[PDB]
Each structure stands twice: as structure tokens, then as C-alpha cells.
Amino acid sequence: SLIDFHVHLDLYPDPVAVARACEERQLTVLSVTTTPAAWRGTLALAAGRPHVWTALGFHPEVVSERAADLPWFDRYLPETRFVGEVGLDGSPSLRGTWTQQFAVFQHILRRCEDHGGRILSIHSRRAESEVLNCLEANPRSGTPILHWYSGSVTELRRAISLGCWFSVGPTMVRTQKGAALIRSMPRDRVLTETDGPFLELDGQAALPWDVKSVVEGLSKIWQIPASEVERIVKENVSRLLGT
Ligand SMILES: [Mn+2]
Numbered sequence: 001s002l003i004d005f006h007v008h009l010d011l012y013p014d015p016v017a018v019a020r021a022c023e024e025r026q027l028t029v030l031s032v033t034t035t036p037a038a039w040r041g042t043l044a045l046a047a048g049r050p051h052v053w054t055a056l057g058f059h060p061e062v063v064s065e066r067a068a069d070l071p072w073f074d075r076y077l078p079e080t081r082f083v084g085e086v087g088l089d090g091s092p093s094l095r096g097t098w099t100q101q102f103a104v105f106q107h108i109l110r111r112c113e114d115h116g117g118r119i120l121s122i123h124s125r126r127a128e129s130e131v132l133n134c135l136e137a138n139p140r141s142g143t144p145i146l147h148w149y150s151g152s153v154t155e156l157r158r159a160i161s162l163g164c165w166f167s168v169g170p171t172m173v174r175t176q177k178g179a180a181l182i183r184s185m186p187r188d189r190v191l192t193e194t195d196g197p198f199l200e201l202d203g204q205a206a207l208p209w210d211v212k213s214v215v216e217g218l219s220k221i222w223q224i225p226a227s228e229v230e231r232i233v234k235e236n237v238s239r240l241l242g243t
Contacts, residue, residue, distance in 0.1 A: 033057040
């Protein structure tokens with residue numbers, strides 16, 4: 001069975017339909033949030049749905065516009081073992097928000113430490129070195145998963161050294177640079193994701209079950225059968241939960 005360990009169920013036009021479809025497939029999803037204020041509404045998608053695992057987040061792209069939602073993060077942290085989407089984004093269009101992004105992410109890591117550590121699904125686009133500096137400074141924040149890692153191989157080697165895990169998606173398994181990044185990752189720290197509906201495949205928003213294509217992609221890169229890839233990813237989720 002399949003795992004999509006970073007997906008925005010709450011950003012689909014009909015989130016309940018997507019959640020139901022995941023349950024029908026017994027497809028485990030990490031349902032991430034973009035502001036902690038979204039917790040109650042997005043958590044509700046998981047009621048009666050044991051394959052929907054909801055994460056408490058604050059996405060770097062919305063830290064300015066949703067600044068006042070920050071106190072809901074600490075409020076709800078006791079209700080989940082999963083934090084995401086959180087992190088930093090180095091895109092020029094967000095650069096004026098950099099101080100606020102850093103403040104929020106540092107706050108989040110510190111609160112995670114204070115509550116005994118969490119499993120983190122982390123955004124690092126164009127800010128990989130800065131994300132790693134933050135994680136190195138806050139090692140007791142928990143287990144960091146770098147979602148859709150797109151930085152350098154130099155930075156990837158450092159992330160591995162810092163104990164990062166990786167969730168990899170459709171674009172990564174289908175590109176030269178992505179396949180090269182995957183080859184440097186320890187297989188026991190690789191998870192699969194879609195990042196739907198943000199990720200588009202063939203001009204259409206990805207759905208969680210498009211993660212079958214990531215498993216197929218990894219089968220080719222690792223040169224093992226898709227079933228063994230599925231087993232390894234499940235084993236990896238079990239081990240992750242053990243951390
Ligand atoms: Mn995302």
C-alpha cells in the first residue's frame with residue numbers, strides 16, 4: 001500500500017472527497033496545514049479516517065499575511081505528533097518577509113523542543129543552508145523531514161549528516177538533478193509524497209494516489225521492484241514513528 005507523506009488535503013476543492021478516496025485505498029497521508037488557525041477544520045477531515053494523519057503548520061509563504069495566527073501553534077501542539085508545513089523560502093518575491101519567516105520558524109522549532117520533539121515536514125526552497133543552520137541550532141526539535149528537497153548535493157550531504165529524512169515527489173524521480181539527489185540519500189530515510197494540489201502533473205493538480213508514480217520512479221532509480229520500494233517506505237514510516 002502507498003504513503004503520501006506531504007499533501008494539502010485542505011486545499012482541494014472537495015477535501016472530504018479526497019480524504020474518503022484515500023481511505024478507500026488505505027493510502028496513508030500526512031495532511032499538512034498552512035496556518036495553525038486551520039487546525040480544527042483540517043483535523044476534522046481525519047475523524048473516522050485512520051489513514052489521515054494531520055500535521056500542524058505555518059507555511060513560510062503566509063507568515064506575514066497570517067502573522068496573528070501564531071499563538072494557535074502552541075495552543076494546538078499537544079494534539080499532534082506531526083508539524084508541517086513549516087520552514088523557510090528564499091524566493092526573491094518573499095524576501096521582504098525573511099525576518100518574519102525566520103522568527104516564526106525559530107519559534108516553531110523551540111516550541112517543538114519544549115513539547116518533547118515532533119516529526120517535522122519542512123519547506124526549504126532556495127533556503128536549504130538556512131534551514132539546516134536552524135535545525136543544527138535546534139537538534140531537540142525532533143526529526144526533520146525535508147520535503148521536496150531541491151538544493152545542492154553539497155547541502156544534501158550536510159542534511160544527511162544532521163539526521164534529516166526526505167520525502168520525494170513526482171518531479172524529483174523524473175529529473176536528472178532529482179534522481180542524482182535521490183541516489184545520495186540513505187534508502188532507510190526516504191519517504192514518498194505528492195504535495196498535491198500544488199504539484200501539477202501534466203497540467204493538473206496532483207492527487208495523493210499519484211504517489212504510485214513516485215514508487216515506480218524509485219523502483220527505476222534504486223533498480224528494485226515497486227513492491228520492495230513500497231515495503232521499504234512502510235518500514236521507514238514505522239521507524240520514523242519510533243523516533
Ligand atoms: Mn506543501
